């Protein structure tokens, strides 16, 4: 009953559910109970129009956000019409019969079905369309071309193959979801005292040692940092009150105490942080902290480059056998609470009245209290998220804060201009935020990074997402939204409720939401937040938990298998290693585990029997596994008969994930702007700590393999004409011009992309080509830091390739692609900035992201940046 569900949830998270019941923290227990309304709401949405609504949850329509087709996509159609193949399975022999239609691109699925019934009968509401080869359905009345599969077929010039299926055949396979509810003052503003914190002593701990402290709002100090006196190592007792230059009523809601135990060496003094810890000055119930408190510290993360870690996670280290700092806060003879919104609202009105009479009767000059000014506000509004905003500009923005509500896009600049250590300014900012006009999701996401910790600011950003973020765009930005959950002060927040609700009403989002959280469960700084979020997801996702457990079981077996191969049988032959794999595959636990589950790279792909004869232990770095499964779909032949995936144990696949996501976003920018630059963002998913899956691109070869004619030629005898000749043999005739054009467009896209992103390495073994001419890159080891062979293909064989008309057309493609991404720089700056909490070695500070500002030449004019890019291309 509930014991079965708790066992399944425990296996999915990799933690028994009873371990959450043992947690004494009232915030943990309140999260577990209070989040359940999000679960109830999602389940009710799924039962509204059951079984159609249940079918839409399990198989959501995979559509683009807009039915409007870019002019170059509409041109690929035949006078606005598409040719589709509709297949029917005629029982008993289960024969596949096809019916070819020529219909308007914007025909809804029921119109297509009716037209297929007409063509079939020439020799209605009881049927649905499915994509041949995978579990993707057309259950909603969107125009056919808006479905990503159809849109993808229009571009690429492939013919859509759809399968007609009885509506009842699908609805009968949807089991009944069993969501069951589980078994489980004074005001801050009347305290007229300055903030002081006592550092008592440290347990579980170079010349001397001290405690470095600071009051922060985000990564910004609200006052000067204050240190304790230096003491010899030993078990240091300080018993020292640290006094801060800030008054208790001026503490913002998101104010934090950031601590460090620092080391001093005498040589120039060398200071090093030994351990760190951050504390929210207010708890989840708005209570100001008081009395004695002990904090277990965390190890210093690699690449800290400062004595404190204000961006770091909040709360005590769960491992209690670590450096433990004892602190004491003042007790104001009562439980002190942050004021209600109505109290803050009254003070904001009284502040606007006081700071108006102060303007008239104040003898001094107050920089914080015309058409040239409106143009200066408009120019500041257009600066990128990493551009510096001076103290004079902050005074300018804050003084015109009411004019700012008319350029809603300026909100991030204005929020940075507020004096967060002044309750008079903050109360006024809350009122402006409360009625601020909504902004576009790509702009609201900026307000969810580490720079904006305020709950009202973050609440506004989430409300913009609830109103304007489509499920397509939510899927596209999922990795960032799951990462910014780490910046939230508390377990229960508006962002977590938005993401969970979305995950629980769209199973495609729920699948990736599960894996982005599960993959970080090894990280103790997020284990509890992500584990509690995972329990609430698993409790309400329905039958999909049974499928997720099968994916988890396959991945655990592959980690175990690859662990034995990398450790115990490392130097044994690939034949002897494959004999071990075939022996492990004869064991029932492994036979079940590595077969008959959905692909974690794309749950629409079923993975049937493991085809060991087509598998191999690769000789590449970290010895990955090349795996091959049968696609058990009734029409697998129309998509792919076998699914090939690389399972790698040892590489941090997060940088590859991020690069592949960015390439996808760049391609959408280009496609929407009428720039057909074909990219290949293949699937890559981090499954855990340096473990993951990579999608194998069918019909691909490295430049190295093409160049050495499969072993005959050696590097010393490498002709720069070989690549072009190989492409001509693979595409003879009219299909040759298409291959050269596809090669040109894809090569242009990758030249610009790798340039802007600063992708290193780049050689004949990490650059690949498909039979049809499509060029792509693999293995993006690092980021934020065009051979003669390609020019010969682009110029169709000419020796003076940099002088042909084809090279001028390729150059224009690159310039337009570069300018299109420069126009969307804030989005890319924001996507990188939101990842600053992952702990990726090549993305640790805003200085790393500033590399994009240089390649995009954001401090120049449009014509000055194009000339910079032309100089880089010519060099």
Residues that bind ligand VY4 (CB under 6 A): 620, 646, 648, 651, 653, 656, 682, 694, 696-697, 700-702, 778-779
Residue 116 CA, distance from chain mean position: 40
Q: Which is nearer to ligand VY4, 672 or 700 (CB)?
A: 700
Cα–Cα dist 311/267, whole Å: 31
Q: Which is nearer to ligand VY4, 322 or 766 (CB)?
A: 766
Cα–Cα dist 627/694, whole Å: 10
Q: Which residues pair with 273 in a beta bridge?
A: 262
Contact 246, 223 (CB under 8 A): yes
Q: Which helix (H) or strand (E) holds 811?
A: helix 805-822
Cα–Cα dist 137/127, whole Å: 11
**Residue 451: CB partners within 8 Å, gap ≥ 6?**
218, 219, 416, 833
Closest approach, Cβ 748 to ligand VY4, in A, equals 20
> Rounded to 5 degrees, what angle do the CA atoms 734, 740, 742 make?
105
**Residue 818: CB partners within 8 Å, gap ≥ 6?**
752, 755, 756, 865, 866, 869
Closest approach, Cβ 706 to ligand VY4, in A, equals 10
Contact 584, 561 (CB under 8 A): yes
Closest approach, Cβ 646 to ligand VY4, in A, equals 6
Closest approach, Cβ 685 to ligand VY4, in A, equals 12
Q: Which is nearer to ligand VY4, 436 or 682 (CB)?
A: 682
Q: Which is nearer to ligand VY4, 489 or 659 (CB)?
A: 659
Contact 215, 195 (CB under 8 A): yes
Structure tokens at 420: 């967060």
Return the DSSP state at 392: H
Closest approach, Cβ 615 to ligand VY4, in A, equals 13
**625-630, strands of its sheet edge to edge:** 616-617, 625-630, 642-649, 691-695, 684-688
Q: Which is nearer to ligand VY4, 502 or 648 (CB)?
A: 648
Give 198-267 as a DSSP string: EEEEEE----EEEEEEEEEETTEESS--EEPPPB-SSS-EEEEEEEEEEEGGG--TT-EEEEEEEEEEE-
Closest approach, Cβ 609 to ligand VY4, in A, equals 21
Q: Measured between alpha carbons, how far apart are the two ends of the chain, in Å? A: 69
Closest approach, Cβ 595 to ligand VY4, in A, equals 22
Q: Which residues pair with 400 in a beta bridge?
A: none
**Phi (first) and psi of residue 693, to 5 degrees:** -120, 145
Contact 407, 377 (CB under 8 A): yes
Q: Which is nearer to ligand VY4, 563 or 589 (CB)?
A: 563
Contact 403, 383 (CB under 8 A): no
Contact 11, 549 (CB under 8 A): yes
Q: Which is nearer to ligand VY4, 559 or 696 (CB)?
A: 696
Return the DSSP state at 63: B
Closest approach, Cβ 28 to ligand VY4, in A, equals 36
Q: Which is nearer to ligand VY4, 779 or 848 (CB)?
A: 779
Q: Which residues pair with 87 in a beta bridge?
A: 98, 163
Closest approach, Cβ 641 to ligand VY4, in A, equals 16
Cα–Cα dist 339/335, whole Å: 12
Q: Which is nearer to ligand VY4, 58 or 694 (CB)?
A: 694
CB atoms within 10 A of CB 201: 17
Q: Which is nearer to ligand VY4, 310 or 624 (CB)?
A: 624
Closest approach, Cβ 590 to ligand VY4, in A, equals 24
Can you give 652-665 as a three-state secondary structure string?
Answer: CCHHHHHHHHHHHH
Q: Which is nearer to ligand VY4, 559 or 697 (CB)?
A: 697
Closest approach, Cβ 708 to ligand VY4, in A, equals 13
Give 457-478 as a DSSP string: HHHHHHHHHHHH--HHHHHHTH
Closest approach, Cβ 613 to ligand VY4, in A, equals 15
Going by DSSP bridges, is the β-strand pair 186-187/336-337 parallel, antiparallel, or unpaired?
Answer: parallel
Closest approach, Cβ 671 to ligand VY4, in A, equals 21
Cis bond upstream, residue 505 (ω within 30): no
Cα–Cα dist 454/465, whole Å: 17
Closest approach, Cβ 617 to ligand VY4, in A, equals 12
Return the DSSP state at 764: T
Cα–Cα dist 638/517, whole Å: 34
Q: Which is nearer to ligand VY4, 535 or 651 (CB)?
A: 651
Closest approach, Cβ 772 to ligand VY4, in A, equals 15
**Residue 278: CB partners within 8 Å, gap ≥ 6?**
216, 256, 257, 258, 259, 309, 310, 312, 313, 314, 315
Closest approach, Cβ 601 to ligand VY4, in A, equals 11
Q: Which is nearer to ligand VY4, 397 or 555 (CB)?
A: 555
Closest approach, Cβ 610 to ligand VY4, in A, equals 18
Q: Which residue is nearest to ligand VY4 (CB)?
A: 697
**Phi (first) and psi of residue 259, to 5 degrees:** -115, 160
Q: Which is nearer to ligand VY4, 507 or 628 (CB)?
A: 628
Closest approach, Cβ 64 to ligand VY4, in A, equals 24
Q: Which is nearer to ligand VY4, 337 or 701 (CB)?
A: 701
**Alpha carbons within 13 A on the beta-carbon side of 754:** 24
Q: Which is nearer to ligand VY4, 261 or 768 (CB)?
A: 768
Q: Is 195 helix (H, G, I), strand (E, B) or coil?
A: strand
Q: Which is nearer to ligand VY4, 620 or 717 (CB)?
A: 620
Of 506, 596, 588, nearest to 547 (Cα)? 596
Q: Which is nearer to ligand VY4, 336 or 680 (CB)?
A: 680
């Amino acid at each position: 009953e509930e014991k079965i569900l708790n066992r399944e949830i425990g296996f999915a998270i990799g933690m028994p559910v009873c371990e959450f019941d043992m947690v004494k923290d009232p915030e943990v227990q309140d999260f577990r109970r209070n989040i359940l309304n999000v679960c109830k709401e999602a389940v009710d949405l799924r039962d509204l129009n059951s079984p159609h609504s249940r079918a839409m949850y399990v198989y959501p329509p995979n559509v683009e956000s807009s039915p409007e087709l870019p002019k170059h996509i509409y041109n690929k159609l035949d006078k606005g019409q598409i040719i589709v193949v509709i297949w029917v399975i005629v029982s008993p022999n289960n024969d596949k019969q096809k019916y070819t239609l020529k219909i308007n691109h914007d025909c809804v699925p029921e119109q297509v079905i009716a037209e297929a019934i007409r063509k079939k009968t020439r020799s209605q509401g009881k049927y649905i369309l499915k994509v041949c080869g995978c579990d993707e359905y057309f259950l909603e009345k969107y125009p056919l071309s808006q479905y990503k599969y159809i849109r993808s077929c229009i571009m690429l010039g492939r013919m859509p193959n759809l399968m007609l299926m009885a509506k009842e055949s699908l609805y009968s396979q949807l089991p009944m979801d069993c969501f069951t509810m589980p078994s489980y003052t004074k005001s801050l503003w009347v305290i007229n005292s300055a903030l002081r914190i006592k550092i008592l002593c440290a347990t579980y701990v170079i010349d001397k040692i001290y405690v470095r402290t600071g009051i922060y709002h985000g990564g910004e100090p609200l006052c000067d940092n204050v240190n304790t006196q230096r003491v010899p190592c030993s078990n240091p007792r300080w018993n020292e009150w640290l006094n801060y230059d800030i008054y208790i009523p001026d503490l913002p809601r998101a104010a934090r105490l950031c601590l460090s135990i620092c080391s001093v060496k005498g040589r120039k003094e060398e200071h090093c942080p030994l351990a760190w810890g951050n504390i929210n000055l207010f708890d989840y119930t708005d209570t100001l902290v008081s009395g004695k408190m002990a904090l277990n510290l965390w190890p210093v993360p690699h690449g800290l480059e400062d004595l404190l870690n204000p961006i770091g996670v909040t709360g005590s280290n769960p491992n209690k056998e670590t450096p433990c700092l004892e602190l004491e806060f003042d007790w104001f003879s009562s439980v002190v609470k942050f004021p209600d919104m109505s109290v803050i609202e009254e003070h904001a009105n009284w502040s606007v009245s006081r700071e108006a009479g102060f303007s008239y009767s104040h003898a001094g000059l107050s920089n914080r209290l015309r058409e040239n000014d409106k143009e200066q506000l408009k120019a500041i509004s257009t600066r990128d998220p990493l551009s510096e905003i001076t103290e004079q500009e902050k005074d300018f923005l804050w003084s015109h804060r009411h004019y700012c509500v008319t350029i809603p896009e300026i909100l991030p600049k204005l929020l940075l201009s507020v004096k967060w250590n002044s309750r008079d300014e903050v109360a006024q900012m809350y009122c402006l935020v409360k009625d601020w006009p909504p902004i576009k999701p790509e702009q609201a996401m900026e307000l969810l990074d580490c720079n904006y910790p305020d709950p009202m600011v973050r609440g506004f950003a989430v409300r913009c997402l609830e109103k304007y973020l489509t499920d397509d765009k939510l899927s596209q930005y999922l990795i960032q939204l799951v990462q910014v959950l780490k910046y939230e002060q508390y377990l229960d927040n508006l962002l977590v409720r938005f993401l969970l609700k979305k995950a629980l009403t769209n199973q495609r989002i729920g699948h990736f939401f599960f894996w982005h959280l599960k993959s970080e469960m090894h990280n103790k700084t997020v284990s509890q937040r992500f584990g509690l979020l995972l329990e609430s997801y698993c409790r309400a996702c329905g039958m999909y938990l049974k499928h997720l457990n099968r994916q988890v079981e396959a991945m655990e077996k592959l980690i175990n298998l690859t662990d034995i191969l990398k450790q115990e049988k490392k130097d044994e032959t690939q034949k002897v290693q494959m004999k071990f794999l075939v022996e492990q595959m004869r064991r029932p636990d492994f036979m079940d585990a590595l077969q008959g589950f959905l692909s974690p790279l794309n749950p629409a792909h079923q993975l049937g029997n493991l085809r060991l004869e087509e598998c191999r232990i690769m000789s590449s770095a970290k010895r990955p596994l090349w795996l091959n499964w049968e696609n058990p779909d009734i029409m697998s032949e129309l998509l792919f008969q076998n699914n090939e995936i690389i399972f790698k144990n040892g590489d941090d696949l997060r940088q590859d994930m991020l690069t592949l996501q960015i390439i996808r976003i760049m391609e959408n920018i280009w496609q929407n702007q009428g720039l057909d630059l074909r990219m290949l963002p293949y699937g890559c998913l981090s499954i855990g700590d340096c473990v993951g899956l990579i999608e194998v691109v069918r019909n691909s070869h490295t430049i190295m393999q093409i160049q050495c004619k499969g072993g005959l030629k050696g590097a010393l005898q490498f002709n720069s004409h070989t690549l072009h000749q190989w492409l001509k043999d693979k595409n003879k005739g009219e299909i040759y011009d298409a291959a050269i054009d596809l090669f040109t467009r894809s090569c242009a896209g990758y030249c610009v992309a790798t340039f802007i992103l600063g992708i290193g390495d780049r050689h004949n073994s990490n650059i690949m080509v498909k039979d049809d001419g499509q060029l792509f890159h693999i293995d993006f080891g690092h980021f934020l830091d065009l051979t003669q062979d390609f020019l010969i293909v682009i110029s169709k064989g000419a020796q003076e390739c940099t002088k042909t008309r084809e090279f001028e057309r390729f150059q224009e493609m690159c310039y337009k692609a570069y300018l299109a991404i420069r126009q969307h720089a804030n989005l890319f700056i924001n996507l990188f900035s939101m990842m600053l909490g992952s702990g990726m070695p090549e993305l640790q500070s805003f200085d790393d992201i500033a590399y994009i500002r240089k390649t995009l030449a954001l401090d120049k004019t449009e014509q000055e940046a194009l000339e910079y890019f032309m100089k880089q291309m010519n060099d």
